[PDB]
Amino acid sequence: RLKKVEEEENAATLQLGQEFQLKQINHQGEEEELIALNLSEARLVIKEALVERRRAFKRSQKKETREKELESIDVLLEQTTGGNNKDLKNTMQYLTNFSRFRDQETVGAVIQLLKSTGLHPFEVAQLGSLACDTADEAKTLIPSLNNKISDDELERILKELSNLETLY
Amino acid sequence: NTQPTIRKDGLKLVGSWKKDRATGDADEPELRVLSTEEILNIFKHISVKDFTSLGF
Amino acid sequence: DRPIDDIVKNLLKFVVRGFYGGSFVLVLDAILFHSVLAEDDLKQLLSINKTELGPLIARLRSDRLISIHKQREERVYYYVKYPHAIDAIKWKVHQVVQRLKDDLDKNSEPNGYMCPICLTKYTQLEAVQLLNFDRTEFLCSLCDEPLVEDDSGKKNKEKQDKLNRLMDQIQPIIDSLKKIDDSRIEENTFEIALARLIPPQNQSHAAYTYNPKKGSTMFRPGDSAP
Amino acid sequence: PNLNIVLTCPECKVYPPKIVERFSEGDVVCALCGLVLSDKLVDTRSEWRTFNPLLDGNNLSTRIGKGETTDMRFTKELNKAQGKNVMDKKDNEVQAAFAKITMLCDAAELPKIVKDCAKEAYKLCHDEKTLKGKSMESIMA
Amino acid sequence: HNGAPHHAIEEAESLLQFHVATYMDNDIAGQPQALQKSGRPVKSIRARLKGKEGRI
Amino acid sequence: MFFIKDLSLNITLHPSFFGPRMKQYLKTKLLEEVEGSCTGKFGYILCVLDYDNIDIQRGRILPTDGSAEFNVKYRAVVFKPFKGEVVDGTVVSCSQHGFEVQVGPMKVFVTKHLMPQDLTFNAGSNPPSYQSSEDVITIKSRIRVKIEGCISQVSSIHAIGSIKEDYLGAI
Ligand SMILES: [Zn+2]
Known part of the structure; x- marks a missing residue:
């Protein structure tokens, strides 16, 4: 039109x-x-659907351990689909290598904080996707972080987000 | 300004602006060929709500 | 008259002198040295032909410079509308600046790839998917022929130098436009140019008199103001 | 671009293939394998059943006149406007020479082949410094 | 582009309008007929798309 | 990036497969044509969410062919490319005019005029690498890259990238 x-x-x-x-x-x-959806929580939530469809297929013929997962879902995906999703293996490798917290409960406690704070959704999803620890270099890297949010409040939430996440 | 009295002719258009603006009645129209440029420009100077009124 | 109007006259003079052919220079210098002209008097004064007069008058129409006048005493007259000339020059310089700046911005980027068989333009990002199986040559979809890079990436400095040198040449014109913006824009008429009548000859058959008929109730394009 | 279609059976490949055309169904088949190559042929006779360009040249000749559902007031304007583009081409002089050699050959009762060959002989040179005018009738003679 | 003597240019642009109109359709109000050689008229688009197996 | 959205997708099926167990067959179908797919509108499509309680509920038989179509509304995880985001992707292949970084689904490439000139490029490297302090293409090859635009086209999607920013490139 x-x-x-x-x-x-x-x-x-x-x-x-x-x-x-x-x-x-x-x-x-x-x-x-x-x-x-952030990088950490995306990597956490994909495994729920992965094990759900795997046990769903197991029931069809009836009728966090990432080193296991990178080969395991490769075997599951080559069982049902072809071996063309080396691209998908690379995407999940990106999902599991550089996400800020390896475990699930730290991300869940971060979400339990964020449901009470009521921050901007795209802004905090970008913050969860990125892996940084100090707010001023995060600001100098990203001008959205420079202009949208005050540095003092950004730092005071960044430390209580960064204490939970497993350091790399 | 006036509108000129428009007579269909052949494959073009002419107009005779009577326009009668002197001290007398001044019935003196000029028959000028309506140039497709000036019709195009005056069409380019019409409002969108005038298009909706005019079925465009 | 106005010294800024004299600056405008010298400005138009320099524009034609440095940026147009010598016949255009001579025509505009004659009509500024004198005033509004019949064509016969100009043809006497320069001893020229209408075949030579034609393309000059046509290009001066095309740049929106000469305001013609037509009236019977039919007798052809020529002058220049000052705001039409100023705004035409202003749109010309702004289009030159924007077109040359965007051409320089495109030309600062690297070339692309050229196929000598089909003789067509290609870009680098189009050639990203034109790599072969072995990343050796840039494969062609039609010719199956290697693609070779153009010579325009070194024309970046050439377009930059042309822009800078042309900017230096037009910098008196930019300064004159600044002084015009300081001054007041004034509108020419045929009768206004008649008030500055500079007599070319002594036997001009075309009388230089503006004589509209009684009941001249027409509003004509290029001859009125809002 | 090389502007080239070559037809080859994708299962025999013995040569530029020994293929035939079935015009009664408009298809082509590699005679060895028996598989089609392409379909829906375009006819090569029906256009000649439907309806001098080499001598008139690349530019194309056009005579204009009157009809039934027209007006005499503007077909006379057309009759005086038909010569407003004869000076753009030298083909007005080419067709004047063609008309005059038609005058000559049919005056000497010469046939169509003699007429077209004289047309060819004019169209061959038609302009040299060796030609140089020479009364304009010597070249046609 | 070259020296226009302001007589041929108007009838020339009228010829341009005439020929694009004739190509557009040749069933106009019959002041012209505007055929092309030979004596059969040039078949325009209302002739292509008229009644009696005119393409529809 | 990695996003969740409701998607409705229509699929068809051959009339010879009108056996009793076709709901799970349609499910299997939905898995192979959802998995391994990149679209221009939503980027790459990763996998499916909410395998149970899927809604298909009705299908139409085509009038001219026995094939019947079925629309499937579902939740899924997808990757959505964007402009101007610093990511720590990995590099697999490199070229002399620039390295080809594989950040997830894309192969983001940086052209010869977008590497910073203060980067100490060496031509004698296998693969040719652009290293100054620590940004070396390795088996990990984690390089901070910013995709300032992902150029989706006819479906061979490529992203453009740059490291002309402070701390960008280096890790
Ligand atoms: Zn064969």
Whole structure:
């Protein structure tokens, strides 16, 4: 419709995507907000669905250990699909190498903090995806971190986020 | 300004602006060929709500 | 008259002198040295032909410089609308600046790759997927032929130097435009140029008089103001 | 670009392949294997059943006139406008020479082949410094 | 582009409009006919898409 | 990046597979054509969420062919590329005009004019590496790269990257 130009540069400074709006609608008729997921929690949540579909397949023929997981889901994925998803093995390797916390309960306690703080969702999802510890060099690296958030409050949440995460 | 009285002719258009602006009645129209440039520019200077009224 | 108007006259003079052919220079210098001209008087004064007069008048139409006048005493007259000339020059210099800046910005980036068989342009990011199986040559989709890089990455400094030298040449014009912006923009008419009539000859058959008819109720394009 | 389609059976490859055309169904088959190559042939006779460009050259000749659902007031304008582009081409002089050699050959009752060969002989040179005018009729003679 | 004597240019641009109109359709109000050689008229698009097996 | 969204996808099925156990067959189907897929709209599609209580509920037989289609609404994990984000990806292959960093699904490449000139490039390296203090392409090859734009096209997706920023590149 009139070529629908809508020229937006994508940036971390609330310069959003053209399809990835904050507000959508869902199939039930209720309002579907935007969902963003960090690197640590994404790596944690994918294994739930992985073991769920593996035991689901095991029931079909009936009717955190990442060193295990990198070969294990390779075997599961080559069992059902082909061996073309070396790209997916690389994506999950990225998900498991550089996520900020290896375990699950530290990320869960971080989420239990964030549900009470009520921070900006895309901002804190970017913070969870990135792996840093001090807020001023995080600011000098990312101008969104420079301008959106005060450094003192960023540091006072960064230390109680960074104490939980396993250091590398 | 006025609109000129427009007579369809052949494969073009002409207009005779009567326009009657002297001290007398001044019935003196000039028959000038309606140049497709000036029709294009005056079409380019129309409002979108005028297009909706005019069925465009 | 206005010394800024004299600066404008010398500005138009220098624009044609440094950026147009000598026939254009002679035509504009004649019509500034004198005033509004019949074509016959100009053809006498320069001893030229209408075949030579044609493309000069046409290009001066094309740059929106000469304001023609047509009236019967039919007699052809020529002048220059000052704000039309100023705004045409302003759009010309702004288009030169933006076009040369974007051309310099594109040319500062490296070349791409050239296929001598099909003789077509290609870019580096288009050639990213044009690598072969062994990363040796850049494979062609049609010709199956290696792709070789252009010579334009060293034309970055050439476009930069052309922009800088042209900017230095137009810097008197930029300063004159600044002084015009300091001053007041004024609109020419045929009768205004008639008030500065500088007599070329003594036997001009075309009388240099603006004589509209009674009941001249027409508003004409290029001849009125909002 | 090399502008080239070559047809080859993908299962025999003995040569540029010994293939045949079945025009009654418009298909092509490698005669050894018996597999199709392509389908829906375009006819090569029906266009000649449907309806001098080499002598008139690449530019194409056009005579214009009147019809039934037209007006005499503008077909006379057309009759005086048909010569407004004859000076753009030298083909007005080419067709004047063609008309005059038609005058000559049919005056001497010469056939169509003699007429077209004289047209060819003019169209061959038609312009040299050796030609140089020479009364314009010596070249046609 | 070259020296226009302001008589041929108007009838020339009228010819341009005439030929694009004739190519567009040749069933116009019959002031021209505008055929091309030979004596059969040039078949324009309303002739291509008219009734009686005109493409529809 | 790694995101969750509701997605509805339509799939079809051959009429010879009209046996009693086709719901699980459709499920298996949904796994191989969801897995290993990169789209332009949502980047690469990783895997599926909420395997149980999936909604298919109805299908239509095509009128001209016995094949029947089925729309599937589901939750999934997908990767969405973006512009201007520092990531610590890994490098597998390198070229003389620039290294090819494999950050997850992409192969983000930095062209010869986007490496900083104060980086001490050596041509005599196998693979050719751009190292100054510690940013060496290794078996780990963790290099801080910023994708300032991922150029999605006809579906051979490539991202552009740069290390022309302080602490970017070096680790
Ligand atoms: Zn064969």
